[PDB]
């Protein structure tokens, strides 16, 4: 799926309340997700069949 199906056919991998209107620390959650995806892909090499799902 292409990016333009993120809310039509595709979902969201990371899920957190940061980006909502009024909620804060969206950038911090983004950095957390970036580091976390890098570390999961570096700790389980060739094992991850598919992307993660980071729920909070």
């Amino acid at each position: 799926h292409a990016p333009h199906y993120i809310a039509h056919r595709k979902g969201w991998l990371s899920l957190h309340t940061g980006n909502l209107d009024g909620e804060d620390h969206a950038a911090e959650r983004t950095v957390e997700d970036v580091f976390l995806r890098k570390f999961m892909w570096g700790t389980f090499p060739g094992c991850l069949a598919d992307q993660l799902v980071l729920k909070r």
């Binding site: 580091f35 890098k38 570390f39 570096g42 700790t43 090499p45």
Partner: peptide, 19 residues
């Protein structure tokens, strides 16, 4: 912090658990 991130990946690397 690019530091705290940076050494942690490389520190774990020579211990034999990261990439």
């Amino acid at each position: 912090n690019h530091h705290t991130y940076a050494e942690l990946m490389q520190t774990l690397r020579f211990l034999g658990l990261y990439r």
